Design a binder for this molecule. Structure first.
Ligand SMILES: CCCCCCCCCCCC(=O)OP(=O)(O)OC[C@H]1O[C@@H](n2cnc3c(N)ncnc32)[C@H](O)[C@@H]1O
Ligand SMILES: CCCCCCCCCCCC(=O)OP(=O)(O)OC[C@H]1O[C@@H](n2cnc3c(N)ncnc32)[C@H](O)[C@@H]1O
Ligand SMILES: [Mg+2]
Ligand SMILES: [Mg+2]
Lengths: 508, 508
């Protein structure tokens, strides 16, 4: 039986490999060995204790996505305090808003990114690191916390922001399931190097690093010196990383612009928005295993998973988000206002709003019982997302299918649009895709591959030429609403254009 | 030739009918005759002058939607100052945000709805009224302003708010067109009573009252004592009013709940969201003329209009928003990034993003040249809305047509859904409607008329019964996503269900 708190599971790794490096930035500064982490947690928690910060107290962790932030989280955990995750880049008014919601007892400021008015009334502690033996006095003193005790808070927006309270179990519930069931969808390897572009104030970022820390991994976060992702993954020789479809799309573009490969890369976790099947297939060709994750902050990150397997690329293109881990219960509410907690009807539908009952679910929105009671009922979380459980057992976030692009009410054949587009001089290859529209059904989006290498002006010139061509040759509604110059066009082995991969990339 | 500023046009009415009442609340307090308005404008402008408020200066008008607010606007106009419209109900952080954007020289506070930090550094003037001859010293002293000089600012949001700078011409450009062209789409009658539920910080509210003030009308605003609209319109015997589809829908419900009528009501102006053809037809049966208006804050309120006429209800149901006033130029950009200001292509399409060139258009977003240059180019405003100019000359904000409700990819017949629903015991009448969805094409929305009069519990009980019925009798995707108990179901004279009126009301 593993320890029941995040901090204890981390310290257990610190006992096995105390000299192993735990946290460091991309360049290498703010580096912490596991023994240095334990020592610094104790010191910072001692500094917090001098500011009336006790068990249950809330601490505003002004994040920098670096080692100092996750140190600050674990320092709060030592007191049994709650680490309120606040983005350092955000304007003062946002952070001032955060303080009013959470009413923190103190603030932990990690460098780096003129302070809010609320911080003038509360204690503020600066947290930074510089460049022995495993101290047993810092290993002792862990507050008697449990899996149900709150650890951190993550903010989520439609307009107004809410504070998602997360217990310790959120960060190990699913990993323990994968271990117990002997599943390989997402795996950790002790000592291996990982990187997170996702901020610590992001549910995906905070969750990922903590899971890696509890598995004794080398976690590289914060201190980005380059906009290049290919560089960081190869410079630091990472094995695993957590991405959003936009960032994975960026990486693939870099892996194409240069005949490149990240050999050290073993596993890629991706999610947050519409998956791009083209980018996933490309990186699986490299030999890297991937796993799509579906979830919310309210569900403690991942709840459904889509790991690398036969036919995976096919269903990801069809809009599959995956299927739940064993122990995570799912329910499709066909009618609004009638969930699984409603008496009578009924069994889960094959289509409807997704309700999730997971051991990683939130405790509830902080200081907001009214809204919490609309989303969290009897352990079930209303995701508010429409899903479809198809006849294969997978859940799809979009529906099938548009064979023609029906704009307004007129059926528009993609082959015709492609033909007209390809009839233009400067174009080598062209493919259109469907852009959904509530008012007009669908829109015509057009991806274009230029024969030559165009600058900013030549590309714009080609764009206006293609549009003027459609104005004359085609008719409404068969006129492209958007025309974009793309490096390449993803196709199946049958030669069929993967238009969903184009659409997903168009939004991202 | 009429005066070129709003203030001068108002004062001209104050010369014709100085004893006529200009502004008052719903109950009757804060009442101002036109001569009392002129006197109070001068005094308040004198009070502003003592706080370094000169021509071009910006004044934060903390609105209350009452007479004191519009007094404050006209007082700013006297100095040639800009009245920054700020909602009093909004939280401190919002108003603090407003001050940072506009950098005001002073603030005019009208009672009623703990002040922002920014107001501690700027002068603050309280403005309230209580209970002779037309003073010629207050009639004189109007700063030499023109139609192009800025008068007020209106804030608009996706997430972040922008300050829309509006010149004087915004408030009389279109009215002057209607007068010159001899059109009757929207008319004013001197002395008549008008009411505005829309706030002064709303573009529709501020615009409406100012137009009525310049036409010498009795303007009732602010100081709402009841939630009943039927009462206010009948108590104060108004002739005209400005509404949003939600409020018009509310009024109709009240006009049904009691066998009632607003006889004094002559004209109803409505717009802002999807028009409900059922509610419009109902109030036109009363004998009241209506006019739909399409526009943005960036276009100085209304730009297109749909007045009461033969076949109007038919096209409003089809999603028509109207057609431009003579002088207002429209352009449908078929492809994103290619507007009317783009060289080459082309003539206006019959489908695309609407660009509007109007004499009522904004001057630009305050202190934001970058975003202004993306929306306001050579006098054209990018509405960002997809419109379709059908073969009748009207512009439609939605497309035709869903004959079947295609959820996922399955064609679903409304007659079948209606039948299953009506087969339930407690239901007298039932009709479904299409709810557009980007991911699944469409959803099934269901409107239900109960045979008896149900309380809150009996209605919920009926709802769950109907849903459980569809779970068993029907199949996905033909299961209703939403089930609502409605008072009645709008039909044509042919008996056909006006399902768009149901959908529009469902969103509102
Ligand atoms: C290895 C694991 C870490 C690597 C991945 C880290 C990213 C995963 C963290 C996700 C949680 C998060 O971002 O917070 P939020 O509450 O905003 O998300 C919820 C909203 O987002 C959308 N959505 C999430 N999943 C999605 C997915 N699969 N397909 C498509 N839409 C997805 C949904 O529409 C939902 O409304
Ligand atoms: C007698 C005249 C006064 C009585 C009416 C007063 C209300 C009219 C004032 C409207 C201006 C306003 O509300 O500001 P905003 O910039 O938010 O509006 C712009 C947005 O709103 C939507 N939209 C406006 N018009 C609409 C209409 N006709 N159909 C459907 N959608 C309409 C559009 O989608 C647009 O994106
Ligand atoms: Mg997300
Ligand atoms: Mg609006």
């Amino acid at each position: 039986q593993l320890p029941s708190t995040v901090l204890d599971r981390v310290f257990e790794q610190a006992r096995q490999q105390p000299e192993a490096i735990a946290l460091r930035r991309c360049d290498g500064t703010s580096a912490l060995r596991y023994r240095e982490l334990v020592a610094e947690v104790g010191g910072l928690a001692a500094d917090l204790r001098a500011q009336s910060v006790s068990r249950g107290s809330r601490v505003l962790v002004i994040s920098d996505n670096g080692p100092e932030t996750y140190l600050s989280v674990l320092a709060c955990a030592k007191l049994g305090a709650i680490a309120v995750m606040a983005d350092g880049n955000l304007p003062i008014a946002a952070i001032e808003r955060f303080c009013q919601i959470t009413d923190p007892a103190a603030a932990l400021v990690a460098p780096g990114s003129a302070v809010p008015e609320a911080l003038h009334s509360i204690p503020v502690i600066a947290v930074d690191i510089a460049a022995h033996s495993l101290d047993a006095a810092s290993l002792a003193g862990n507050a008697d916390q449990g899996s149900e005790d709150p650890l951190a808070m993550i903010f989520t927006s439609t307009g107004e922001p809410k504070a998602v309270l997360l217990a310790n179990r959120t960060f190990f519930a699913v990993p323990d399931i994968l271990q117990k069931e002997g599943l390989n969808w997402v795996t950790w390897v002790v000592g291996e190097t990982t990187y997170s572009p996702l901020p610590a104030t992001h549910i995906g970022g905070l969750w990922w690093i903590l899971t890696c820390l509890m598995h004794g991994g080398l976690c590289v976060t914060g201190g980005e010196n380059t906009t290049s992702l290919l560089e960081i993954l190869t410079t630091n020789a990472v094995a695993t990383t957590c991405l959003v479809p936009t960032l994975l799309s960026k990486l693939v573009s870099e892996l194409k612009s240069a005949n490149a490969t990240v050999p050290s890369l073993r596993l890629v976790g991706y999610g947050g928005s519409r998956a791009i099947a083209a980018d996933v297939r490309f990186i699986e060709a490299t030999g890297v295993r991937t796993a799509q994750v579906y979830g919310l902050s309210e569900t403690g990150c991942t709840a459904l998973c889509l790991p690398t397997d036969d036919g995976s690329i096919v269903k990801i293109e069809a809009g599959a988000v995956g299927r739940p881990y064993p122990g995570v219960d799912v329910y499709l509410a066909a009618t609004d206002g009638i969930g699984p907690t409603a008496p009578g009807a009924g069994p889960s539908a094959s289509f409807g709003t997704l309700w999730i009952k997971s051991p990683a679910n939130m405790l509830g929105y902080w200081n907001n019982p009214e809204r919490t009671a609309e989303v969290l009922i009897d352990g079930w979380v209303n995701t508010g997302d429409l899903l479809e459980r198809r006849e294969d057992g997978f859940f799809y976030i979009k529906g099938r299918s548009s064979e023609m692009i029906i704009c307004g009410g007129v059926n528009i054949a993609p082959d015709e649009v492609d033909r007209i587009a390809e009839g233009v001089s400067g174009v080598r290859e062209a493919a259109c895709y469907e852009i959904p529209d509530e008012e007009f059904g669908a829109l015509v989006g057009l991806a274009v591959v230029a024969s030559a290498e165009l600058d900013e002006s030549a590309a714009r010139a080609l764009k206006h030429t293609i549009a003027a061509r459609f104005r004359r040759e085609s008719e409404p509604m068969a006129r492209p609403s958007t025309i974009v110059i793309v490096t390449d066009i993803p196709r199946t082995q049958s030669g069929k254009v993967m238009r969903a991969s184009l659409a997903a990339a168009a939004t991202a």
